[PDB]
Design a protein around this ligand. Structure first.
Ligand code: FAD
Ligand code: FAD
Ligand code: FAD
Ligand code: FAD
Lengths: 430, 430, 430, 430
């Protein structure tokens, strides 16, 4: 046990720091004049282009597979620094890394080689998307007896036909609504999309993931793929996770990521449990910019009295608590990622640790922005301070990458319920 | 001890709902299409005009002073209700009420007759503002040995000369930046305003209130009253509370609301204690809107599953916690306004109850919207639900109207520390 | 609406305070010297005797039925003052009250007259118990599908035969293990006590309540009613709430309280809803003792510094939090028992209000004792202060009178899920 | 960054579980029959004897000093295992670790060799005690202008003369009230103890540590050293920390630990910072006992339902919240201790980290035990579960070892207020 950072870990951080200040700081002058969600997301392209030009997309892909990813701790340190300054574009890198996951994670070197190609290249503006989420929601997608997913696939010849709607998956229609360079569309296999799911089949056995690229979309009727809309979001106002209708959408059997069933759900599960751990780095960075603006203010403004605000017990108390949450949070994300990475542990041990991390860090970052604001007082509520932005931004986190109430709390409840559950396995082994 | 409502109480409510539904829901369509705080405030003018026509401004003024205000519970009921639908305009009404309070509460019938006449007339869109807050903060305005207010006043012959800046005062510039129809400006008396407050005088002894009209400003040089700015706020985006610089600004002695010193500080303290209790009705309206939107969703939505979202223990739990916060908060606000109205009670007993009320109800309203958003899940985060508006608006309450950390917890703590403190005196008597 | 107390509410307070000061403060000299739960219960008899002689057992039966109960607001006020000083004996009174409740609430003049007679006489030390609780739990006692209560009854000729175990019912074995003077035993009906509950009959349809007296027990065989043990409890170390076995226990049909089924369940439910609301007065008393002990200490102790510790903002903050929780809880309790007494309101509005009361008051009393200890510091942890006793006493409340996690939040949740639920009905009617 | 345990960190754990299971489990039979705090402590003497025989006292001293302590993380893992089973004796081993710390931390090799001999011995029952706390309190001992420590020392010839009272220091009177084998007595230097601390001198410059053995006490008159009492504690009922008076108590110059003043104060600070960090492991163990007992219950108990109660979202949510707290706590304890051992790091940085750890782990473990009791329900309140023991044990943690409100938060506030404060020095370097 050791918490020291190697020189490569410190360079990643200097690097992510330098990119956030020199490039990210300028994003806002471009997007803030834009009209609606997409205009703002599009005003973001030059900065994501830089992100690739700085090698940050290549760093989403492990070295065995062509990329420059050194570890998940490196990745945790980079996201925290990025989010600490500007979640525009930074959010696009992460959506893209999530998009690449189920490939990154498969049995097929040829799929890996085929699909990872534009991201590991160092040029353009390539975008991935794990399209799981729907208009009718997903907390119960694996429930025996229930509607299951409403994006369905049937096999017609040597292709697959997709029928169904998706909502929220970031990046999913690219910069232009012609689609994203790669997108892993998660489906339920239904021969007849007019049939309810069979209440007697395990929903997990019917999962299929089907890659879909700008090519697939194009080799298809102009209306087999339409963008019905784009949510106007409370914060993260430069992201795109549109409403997408699939109508008789043809995709080649070669684009099938793995056997449908338990193996396809495994990859979606594993992808999502990784992003669950990494997302705490996003919360950390946001709440960290809250606390740091609050700290600098409290150490330099006396608010009409004789001493700096930090000298009031109640002010220091709010700051102490933010600090505590940030520190315990970080420790937990690093603990989580390192546990994911450890080949000796069973999956369910790694999954329990990831759910904890997602739940704790996202919940606690909310508390941390709000205490920061409360300590600054009325000033924190005017837009010449970061706080109105941070507050909207920070509320995404318990909600997204699978909300705490619906998904992550249940996934951890299921694991704890198991006969052979070991609460301390990630620490004390066995 | 009795909680049943009277006929006038039930009608006050039916009337406020009818006005919020038929008039206030139409406001968004007008203010949304505007680019800056001030435009969005100006766009609200017709709704304020209807409110006067509906009696609602006249009902900010006590019956014996010519108004129609029936009781502070009547006021409470109406503000919850207005605030459960649309804070735009609603917040103008309550800011006019605060602005009218130091006149309401003074003991001079000729000043009352004169200055309250516009606001009981049934006509126009007259605005009032209590101009207290300052760019440097006010948590410490009564600190002995501190700098004190930065708006000072001095007597020159037969008039008063205001110098310095105000920030945040709702409505203070008016519809058009030529002033509110009535402003009570709170100033610290200083002969040489470039010399520090004397460390040796109780700051409360130097407080003056000066009434400043559209006329007083019209009778001064153009650069003697300058709006330097209008904060862009997170929520309540249709309010106005500019940054105003008074430079050698002449007020007539007949505009002095009373003799400078402890009586003047006392009128201001009593004004902010009353609004400290009432602001809980605002908090409860905004959180009720959250809890109700969530509740209706939880009961009409299975969120891809077999059963309505409310049949899940963790979902019910959040809704239960919100309900309880709403319930306890309303009880407290009614308890507190009823306390303020009790003649048999010492002011310290009334002060303490009003501070409790503001702290609790405002803190817990935030918890309430956030818990509602959580139970609704990802959908609560897009702007075709009310939540992203509700969240930004609720964060105002702990911060504004004297912030809890700096102002109200300290006012309460001064009373608790007094030798003669009777914790339960509002309940069980002296 | 009104919070002013009448002269008899003031008197009731005066009288409960004088009783607690002059009588209840002496109990501890007697019981502390004792070896087990029961001897501590037994050492408390002279104090219950004084309770009876001060008319306090009679004040648990309403005037229409021959007792002196003035109103549930009166009751609340007495409970607060008893528990503010001494829960021993105080607990026995409220347990007697609960055990009388189903006779009180049954619409049957001959039963009322026969069974309440000892409790209105102002003589002896008669005890009553409501025997619902069981060794295997009771949160799921109305679950269709489930095993249901395991105290069953069957009618065998002109009489009823009880077989099963009860645990936790206060006072149930009387002073001497020969039985409470009146016990209401809730059973599930099964003609064959070895058959599992029929999973297609709604459990509420099978509830019976049988009245047992020391005479019913004496006309049974010795081994038909055995006390199997007495829990040694964290706090309230002077209550008896035994483990009881019923083996072939013979009860006269005419000791049957009402027709088995929904009417019988409905009686148990009403009794428990009323104690739900009144138990908040207990939680308040205990929490209030803690707060008032910390307050007086904060106001007189400098802790080796130069000011009373109440002048430290982190000290003030905790006591402010305690005051807020006490104040809200009391308002809530009075709202609840007032709601319960309203004939115009339907059952579910009342039950929901009561559940809300039990949940909030009992959770938040814990926090209020723990924060009071943190305020005082080390010294709170030693038995020359009250805090050790209160700590253990306050933690009963979330758990007993139907726990919040499994009983009260489920009852409240079931109400909130009905299509015809009106959240604000107890406040603004329908 | 690495979280994997070394084979000796694993053996430390095994060794500690073994000791606790085989030895500590037997203490309760012995101490439970004893009728006061000292009697209960005395009953423990055979278990501390066994702990010395297992080398646990020797493991409290670093290797270069003739001890067997391998690292602070080993120490943390050890104390977690002792406290997860039984704080009796365990509490004495850490109290002795603390009493030894001023001596271990001093820069003086022959004083080490002399005073540490009996603790690295492997033999007897030697006790140490850090005697700092006083009847009047210690949160403000360092306050310029305040009263200061009420235990004072003056130089007389070649001896020091102690006057005043200590309260709470653990083990301070020995097994028999003739004193601990080594007590470090913290005094304020004063030539006339009847005269107030000089308000113009920095309290930290007047600090002296005198080492007092059974010999030092033996060489004095009977009434120079006297135990005036022994607090009866809520929890930790077998530990001793008496009320001690010193009256003209004479200590030799060779027993002064170091030069009075800032060097001496720094030795006290350093020792209490180390315990502040390590005490989290005590808190983790108590809260873990609670979590684990409830988790077991939850997966074996249906509570008359048809499913194990962990199957209920509300129950699981409780256990999830506990687990998060214990996980985050442990990470933070390991971070804190590792940070203290970092020679490359500045003291402020180590200090802040240790303060954070104490505040979090000891606050959050109270919540953890209370949540666990809520999940188990009525049953947790009876003394045949371990919860009544845990509940009183846990509430010591936020209070003892420097309370969180008075001491630990204030220390952290002063570091955060420093101009050259680096929030992340411990994670990211300077
Ligand atoms: C910026 C942003 C980016 C996003 N990026 C992506 C992306 O790359 N890929 C993608 O797939 N999605 C993405 N989303 C969606 C995101 O992951 C959501 O978390 C996902 O929609 C699941 O949402 P939900 O947890 O609210 O569950 P929902 O199904 O919408 O359920 C909502 C609520 O119902 C309740 N509930 C439902 N079922 C249960 C139950 N069984 N038990 C208890 N409570 C229950 C819970 O309160 C829950 O909060 C994005 C969203 C945003 C805002
Ligand atoms: C919608 C809206 C309407 C408004 N309407 C009005 C109005 O009608 N009239 C008017 O005058 N103003 C108005 N304002 C301002 C509002 O009343 C503010 O609450 C007021 O500016 C005081 O803010 P503050 O409590 O943050 O104090 P500040 O003095 O600005 O200090 C801010 C922070 O410093 C810390 N702090 C400072 N001093 C202390 C201390 N001694 N102890 C502990 N902590 C301390 C606290 O954390 C505090 O929150 C309005 C603002 C808004 C958004
Ligand atoms: C099991 C056990 C073991 C112990 N072992 C030892 C030991 O080995 N050595 C030893 O010396 N002591 C020991 N004690 C004492 C222990 O370390 C206490 O923490 C110590 O007495 C200080 O307590 P306190 O923090 O409550 O400070 P106090 O000075 O007693 O202050 C009490 C309260 O006053 C308020 N307060 C006072 N000043 C301020 C301020 N300036 N700002 C804000 N709030 C303030 C705070 O709420 C604080 O909680 C032990 C006690 C126990 C129960
Ligand atoms: C001082 C004292 C006096 C008492 N007086 C009486 C009395 O007069 N009469 C009487 O009948 N009893 C009495 N009892 C018992 C008391 O009312 C208990 O509340 C009752 O035993 C039920 O306990 P419980 O809520 O924990 O339910 P249990 O059935 O014992 O359940 C325990 C825990 O399991 C979990 N759980 C079980 N089912 C569910 C579910 N469906 N959903 C979510 N979680 C669930 C919850 O976390 C719950 O807290 C007394 C107890 C004490 C300590």
């Amino acid at each position: 046990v050791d918490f020291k950072l190697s020189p490569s870990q410190l360079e990643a951080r200097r690097h992510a720091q330098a990119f956030a200040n020199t490039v990210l700081t300028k994003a806002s002058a471009e997007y803030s004049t834009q009209k609606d969600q997409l205009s703002r997301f599009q005003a973001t392209r030059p900065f994501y282009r830089e992100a690739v030009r700085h090698g940050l997309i290549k760093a989403q892909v492990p070295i065995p597979l062509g990329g420059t990813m050194e570890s998940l701790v490196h990745e945790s340190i980079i996201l925290e620094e990025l989010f600490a300054v500007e979640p525009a574009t930074s959010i696009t890198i992460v959506a893209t890394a999530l998009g690449l996951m189920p490939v990154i994670l498969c049995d097929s070197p040829s799929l890996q080689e085929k699909f990872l190609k534009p991201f590991i290249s160092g040029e353009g503006e390539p975008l991935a998307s794990l399209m799981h989420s729907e208009p009718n929601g997903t907390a119960n997608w694996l429930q025996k007896g229930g509607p299951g997913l409403q994006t369905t696939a049937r096999k017609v010849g040597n292709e697959w036909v997709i029928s169904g709607e998706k909502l929220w998956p970031s990046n999913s229609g690219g910069w232009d609504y012609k689609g994203a360079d790669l997108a892993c569309v998660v489906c339920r296999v239904s021969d007849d999309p007019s049939k309810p799911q069979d209440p007697n089949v395990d929903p997990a056995t019917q999962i299929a993931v089907l890659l879909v690229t700008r090519e697939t979309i194009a080799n298809n009727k102009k209306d087999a793929y339409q963008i019905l809309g784009e949510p106007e979001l409370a914060g993260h106002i430069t992201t795109s996770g549109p409403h997408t209708r699939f109508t008789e959408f043809h995709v080649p059997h070669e684009n099938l990521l793995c056997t449908p069933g338990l193996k396809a759900q495994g990859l979606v599960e594993t992808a999502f449990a990784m992003s669950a751990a990494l997302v705490g780095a996003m919360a950390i960075g946001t709440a960290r910019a809250a606390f740091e603006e609050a700290l600098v203010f409290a150490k330099s403004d006396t608010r009409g009295g004789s001493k700096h605000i930090i000298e009031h017990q109640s002010v220091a108390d709010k700051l102490i608590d933010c600090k505590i949450r940030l520190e315990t949070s970080r420790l937990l994300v690093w603990k989580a990622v390192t546990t994911l990475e450890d080949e000796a542990l069973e999956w369910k041990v790694k999954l329990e640790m990831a759910m904890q991390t997602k739940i704790y860090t996202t919940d606690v970052a909310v508390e941390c922005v709000i205490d920061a604001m409360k300590a600054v007082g009325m000033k924190s509520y005017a837009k010449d301070m970061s706080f109105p932005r941070l507050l909207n931004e920070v509320m995404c986190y318990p909600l997204f990458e699978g909300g705490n109430i619906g998904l992550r709390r249940r996934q951890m409840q299921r694991v704890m319920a198991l006969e052979d559950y070991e609460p301390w396995a990630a620490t004390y082994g066995s």
